[PDB]
């Protein structure tokens, strides 16, 4: 719906840059209804699973901004988020063989910095962020 | 439930009912407790955990980095949130610390004052818990995959040791005699387990896909060789009578000791009658293991129904032992899961994993 419209308007790689007005509109829409974000993750898995690395970066940034801002993606990324733990363990680490890793190295660095930020941003009881960061630092950063 | 409290109170049901039924209900509700944590001390993956059989207060933990950590599992703080603090630790600086991965660690049954730990440095070290000094060291010519002390032997104090050698070594802690060997396997013994029922019955599993039960008193070889089919494919035993179609890297007697659960790298678990090694044909579906070393898994105790908690890649798969129905898969680890251990007092599960974490699973509500 409108979630998909905003996802298309933002993830488009023809203008691959962070736009604040669209992101604040998405934040306000997600705050208006929690069900906006539960399908948004499904949209983001579309963008993470897409061929273009810029779309993956855009969907990662959208997920991060919804988790840190909307207060509805927080209840997806810091509660009922084993999907998020597995996507963190599969994104930076090697994709499970035979399927190899398809993201770009700049996207790997961006994910590393996002994990380092989220270690302190929301870690009141979610320590698997830090555990995954340590595993990366000792196995496939 | 209030029916259960009223039934207990009025004697309609034996209190055993409420205990066991509630214990089961608690097991089904196992969930990653973020209201409980275990202090991170291993630099490497946790290969083994052991909650002490008496009082279930302390846990040992053996790491791939060679350190043994000794945790206290009681919430001594008044908060509802606590971290199981590490009491002692055989650290990188201990003169007796293992040189390589600690592969097994075990409380001496009958007493918390002594525990034993075996490693890939080819040693089984006996420790005095209090002074935390080795009391004994058994050297093996080959790397130790697992050892096990009898949970039941008031009489003998043998440690069965499985190494990459094809032979099972019995180490008598009473006057130190590491000569006795059980012969009959052909490849590394990846798992050994004493019967919890019979004082001198030992089950040993090997990479040659065969599991043998021994009467170590006996001077005449294995009692039983577990056979997948029970005789449908029958051959003069030279290569047949394989428990699995891969390596058998895990053993666990059920609580009462009447059945044996084996997991092998054919991605199967089987349930065997420990008396005649007959296959009960419990299905269990597909159990992913590809562990190249021993796979430490446990059963529940004191519930209405018995459960088995098996590492399933990065998760703990919970199965009903006697029907095979998969209860659930507990998803909270990041890398493959190496060991899970069951706290029989409160239906709590601790699982170590290669990601240097020990996760507590406690029943919800």
UniProtKB/Swiss-Prot annotation, chain A:
Disulfide bonds: none annotated. Residues 1-18 are annotated as: Disordered. Residues 1-8 have a biased composition (Basic and acidic residues). It is found in: Chromosome. Residues 1-141 are annotated as: VHS-like. Factor involved in transcription-coupled nucleotide excision repair (TC-NER), a mechanism that rapidly removes RNA polymerase II-blocking lesions from the transcribed strand of active genes. Acts as a key adapter that promotes recruitment of factors involved in TC-NER. Facilitates the ubiquitination of the elongating form of RNA polymerase II (RNA pol IIo) at DNA damage sites, thereby promoting RNA pol IIo backtracking and access by the TC-NER machinery to lesion sites. Belongs to the UVSSA family. It is linked to UV-sensitive syndrome 3: An autosomal recessive disorder characterized by cutaneous photosensitivity and slight dyspigmentation, without an increased risk of skin tumors. Interacts with the elongating form of RNA polymerase II (RNA pol IIo) during transcription stress. Interacts with the TFIIH complex during transcription stress. Interacts with ERCC6. Interacts with ERCC8. Interacts with USP7. This is UV-stimulated scaffold protein A. It comes from Homo sapiens (Human). The chain holds residues 3 to 143 of 709 of the full protein.
Curated annotation (Swiss-Prot), chain B:
It is found in: Nucleus; Chromosome; Nucleus matrix. Its main location: nucleus. InterPro entries: G-protein_beta_WD-40_rep, Rad28/ERCC8/Ckn1/ATCSA-1, WD40/YVTN_repeat-like_dom_sf, WD40_repeat_CS, WD40_repeat_dom_sf, WD40_rpt. Changing residue 334 to A: Defects in transcription-coupled nucleotide excision repair (TC-NER). This is DNA excision repair protein ERCC-8. Substrate-recognition component of the CSA complex, a DCX (DDB1-CUL4-X-box) E3 ubiquitin-protein ligase complex, involved in transcription-coupled nucleotide excision repair (TC-NER), a process during which RNA polymerase II-blocking lesions are rapidly removed from the transcribed strand of active genes. Following recruitment to lesion-stalled RNA polymerase II (Pol II), the CSA complex mediates ubiquitination of Pol II subunit POLR2A/RPB1 at 'Lys-1268', a critical TC-NER checkpoint, governing RNA Pol II stability and initiating DNA damage excision by TFIIH recruitment. The gene is ERCC8. The keyword Cell membrane does not apply. The keyword DNA repair applies. Part of the CSA complex (also named DCX(ERCC8) complex), a DCX E3 ubiquitin-protein ligase complex containing ERCC8, RBX1, DDB1 and CUL4A; the CSA complex interacts with RNA polymerase II; upon UV irradiation it interacts with the COP9 signalosome and preferentially with the hyperphosphorylated form of RNA polymerase II. Interacts with ERCC6/CSB (via CIM motif); promoting recruitment to lesion-stalled RNA polymerase II (Pol II). Interacts with KIAA1530/UVSSA. Interacts with a subunit of RNA polymerase II TFIIH. One of its GO terms (biological process) is response to X-ray. One of its GO terms (cellular component) is Cul4-RING E3 ubiquitin ligase complex. Pfam families: WD40 (PF00400). GO terms for molecular function: ubiquitin-like ligase-substrate adaptor activity. It comes from Homo sapiens (Human). WD repeats lie at residues 33-73, 88-129, 133-173, 177-216, 235-274, 281-321, 325-363. Pathway: Protein modification; protein ubiquitination. Keywords: Chromosome, Cockayne syndrome, Deafness, Disease variant, DNA damage, DNA repair, Dwarfism, Nucleus, Phosphoprotein, Repeat, Ubl conjugation pathway, WD repeat. It is linked to Cockayne syndrome A: A rare disorder characterized by cutaneous sensitivity to sunlight, abnormal and slow growth, cachectic dwarfism, progeroid appearance, progressive pigmentary retinopathy and sensorineural deafness. There is delayed neural development and severe progressive neurologic degeneration resulting in intellectual disability. UV-sensitive syndrome 2: An autosomal recessive disorder characterized by cutaneous photosensitivity and mild freckling in the absence of neurological abnormalities or skin tumors.
């Amino acid at each position: 719906q409108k979630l998909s419209k905003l996802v298309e308007e933002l993830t488009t790689s023809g203008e691959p840059r962070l736009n604040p007005e669209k992101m604040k509109e998405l934040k306000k829409i997600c705050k208006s209804s929690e069900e906006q974000l539960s399908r948004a993750y499904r949209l983001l898995i579309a963008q993470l699973t897409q061929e273009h690395a810029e779309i993956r970066l855009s969907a990662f940034q959208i997920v991060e901004e919804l988790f840190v801002r909307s207060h509805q993606f927080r209840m997806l990324v810091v509660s009922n988020f084993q999907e998020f733990l597995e996507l963190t363990l599969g994104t930076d680490p090697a994709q499970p063989l035979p399927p190899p890793r398809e993201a770009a190295q700049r996207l790997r660095q961006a994910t590393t910095r996002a994990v380092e930020g989220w270690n302190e941003k929301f870690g009141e009881a979610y320590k698997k962020l830090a555990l995954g960061y340590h595993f990366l630092r000792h196995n496939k950063k | 439930m209030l029916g259960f409290l009223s039934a207990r109170q009025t004697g309609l049901e034996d209190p055993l009912r409420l205990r066991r039924a509630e214990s089961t209900r608690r097991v089904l509700g196992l969930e990653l407790n973020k209201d409980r944590d275990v202090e991170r001390i291993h630099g490497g993956g946790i290969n083994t955990l052991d909650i002490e059989p008496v009082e279930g207060r302390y846990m040992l933990s053996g790491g791939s980095d060679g350190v043994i950590v000794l945790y206290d599992l009681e919430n001594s703080s008044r908060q509802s949130y606590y971290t199981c603090k590490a009491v002692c630790s055989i650290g990188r600086d201990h003169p007796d610390v293992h040189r390589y991965s600690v592969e097994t660690v075990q409380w001496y049954p009958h007493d918390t004052g002594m525990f034993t730990s075996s490693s890939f440095d080819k040693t089984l070290k006996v420790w005095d818990t209090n002074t935390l000094q080795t009391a004994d060291v058994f050297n093996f010519e080959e790397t130790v995959y697992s050892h096990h002390m009898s949970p039941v032997s008031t009489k003998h104090c043998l440690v069965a040791v499985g190494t990459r050698g094809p032979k099972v070594q019995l180490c008598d802690l009473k006057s130190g005699s590491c000569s006795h060997i059980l012969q009959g396997h052909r490849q590394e013994i990846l798992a050994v387990s004493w019967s919890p029922r019979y004082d001198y019955i030992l089950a040993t599993a090997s990479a040659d896909s065969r599991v043998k039960l021994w009467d170590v008193r006996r001077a005449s070889g294995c009692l039983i060789t577990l056979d997948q089919h029970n005789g449908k494919k029958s051959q003069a035993v030279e290569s047949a009578n394989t428990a699995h179609n891969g390596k058998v890297n895990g053993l666990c007697f059920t609580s009462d000791g009447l059945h044996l659960l084996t997991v092998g790298t054919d991605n199967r678990m089987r349930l065997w009658n420990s008396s005649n090694g007959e296959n009960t044909l419990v299905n269990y579906g597909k159990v992913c293991n590809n562990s190249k070393k021993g796979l430490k898994f446990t059963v529940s105790c004191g519930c209405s129904s018995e459960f088995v908690f098996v590492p399933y890649g990065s998760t703990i798969a919970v199965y009903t032992v006697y029907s095979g129905e998969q209860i659930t898969m507990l998803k909270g680890h990041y890398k493959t899961v190496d060991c899970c251990v069951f706290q029989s007092n409160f239906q709590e599960l601790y699982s170590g994993s290669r990601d240097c974490n020990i996760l507590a699973w406690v029943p919800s509500l």
